[PDB]
Design an enzyme around this catalytic site. Sequence first.
Site, PDB file in Angstrom:
ATOM      1  N   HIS A  94       1.120   0.557   0.342  1.00 32.47           N
ATOM      2  CA  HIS A  94       1.433   1.741   1.202  1.00 32.47           C
ATOM      3  C   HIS A  94      -0.067   1.913   1.710  1.00 32.47           C
ATOM      4  O   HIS A  94      -0.833   2.471   1.137  1.00 32.47           O
ATOM      5  CB  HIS A  94       2.119   2.466   0.473  1.00 32.47           C
ATOM      6  CG  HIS A  94       2.637   3.856   1.513  1.00 32.47           C
ATOM      7  ND1 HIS A  94       3.462   3.595   2.551  1.00 32.47           N
ATOM      8  CD2 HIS A  94       2.236   5.052   1.582  1.00 32.47           C
ATOM      9  CE1 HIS A  94       3.702   4.688   3.313  1.00 32.47           C
ATOM     10  NE2 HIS A  94       3.082   5.552   2.685  1.00 32.47           N
ATOM     11  N   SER A 110       0.887   5.863   7.779  1.00 31.38           N
ATOM     12  CA  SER A 110       1.957   6.564   6.972  1.00 31.38           C
ATOM     13  C   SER A 110       2.569   7.314   8.275  1.00 31.38           C
ATOM     14  O   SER A 110       2.889   6.749   9.397  1.00 31.38           O
ATOM     15  CB  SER A 110       1.866   7.302   5.845  1.00 31.38           C
ATOM     16  OG  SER A 110       1.431   6.433   4.801  1.00 31.38           O
ATOM     17  N   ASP A 119       7.083  -2.357   2.306  1.00 30.31           N
ATOM     18  CA  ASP A 119       6.313  -0.950   2.091  1.00 30.31           C
ATOM     19  C   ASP A 119       6.842  -0.229   1.111  1.00 30.31           C
ATOM     20  O   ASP A 119       8.044  -0.112   1.125  1.00 30.31           O
ATOM     21  CB  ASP A 119       6.359  -0.181   3.582  1.00 30.31           C
ATOM     22  CG  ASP A 119       5.615   0.807   3.461  1.00 30.31           C
ATOM     23  OD1 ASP A 119       4.382   0.784   4.034  1.00 30.31           O
ATOM     24  OD2 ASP A 119       6.219   1.984   3.321  1.00 30.31           O
TER      25      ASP A 119
END
Length: 348
Positions: free
Chosen positions: A294, A145, A248
């Site tokens: 994710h 991330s 995503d």
Amino acid sequence: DLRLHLLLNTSVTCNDGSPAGYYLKESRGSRRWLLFLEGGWYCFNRENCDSRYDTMRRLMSSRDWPRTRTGTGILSSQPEENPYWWNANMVFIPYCSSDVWSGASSKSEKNEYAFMGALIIQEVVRELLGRGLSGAKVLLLAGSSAGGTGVLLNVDRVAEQLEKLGYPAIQVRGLADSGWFLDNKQYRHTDCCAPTEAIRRGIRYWNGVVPERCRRQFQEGEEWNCFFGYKVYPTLRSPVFVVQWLFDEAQLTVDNVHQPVQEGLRLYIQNLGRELRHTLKDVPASFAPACLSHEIIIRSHWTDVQVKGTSLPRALHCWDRSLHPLKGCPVHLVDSCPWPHCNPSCPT
Ligand SMILES: O=C(O)c1cc2c(s1)-c1ccccc1CC2
Ligand SMILES: *[C@@H]1O[C@H](CO)[C@@H](O)[C@H](O)[C@H]1NC(C)=O
């Protein structure tokens, strides 16, 4: 378990002035070192950082951190869970700077918060050399991330830092997971937030820093561009492996995408996966499944997902071999099918 050490240089701090740190599990028989950057969005002004301090305080402060953390996924020491690098020295660097790992700014009479992500990385590397990193042959800087974007912003600086400290033999590489975003138009407009404008404000607020060649291309006022993987990647000299879901969840969130899907949205989502595929065409080491999800690399079941019949741990081992055209050992693995979960191995 990985064990907590707070930085001995206590000028290098989390947002609230408390010391930053790292979690470490050593492997005496290995010369491989894995430094993982945690993610967790960011904040870009006083009001928005104050709110984060109320309800996300562990991403701003070390005061309540626990003494240990269990290694999962690529940070696991069990071959069954981590076929790739189970015998490596493992480092987890908590994200407590809210600056996508880009800041070089102290807390002071003019600054309510410190934004020191870029300096935290450099200081962890410095203090680890005395705990065995000086004997390393590979340093893999990984992250998920905001931590994956942080790999792209910091891997070349870690390499330059070690070359100037007298350690040219250590090979620095990057692994960037779920941090490859597009500065595209939103499906339905909102008030700020679109990825472009949020980053523009943050850089000024953090005094954020970007890699030198990318800074020299876009120049003053336009450094926000270097936060977007397809713009900063071509400027990098260190080898970087890119892991990115084609759909995503965080990309869809910033795009304001949330029953039968109607034609307009279907076309928006299909064009989004096509654009992501296109930006990866000339990235030789990459893993990009057609899934709505994710992050992946510190998930316990990261071994399960496959692209063209090859798992992520296998692709990473093939990458290792390529850095020593391999038969049955691919490194560029990008799905071509155009809708979420057209790949049957997607997470459930
Ligand atoms: O979930 C997280 O941690 C992150 C989500 C996003 C990040 S980070 C970002 C990093 C660079 C450029 C644009 C963005 C917007 C989406
Ligand atoms: C502590 O960190 C700051 C910020 O990076 C640096 O300027 C200073 O030299 C460091 N001090 C020591 C003793 O390493």
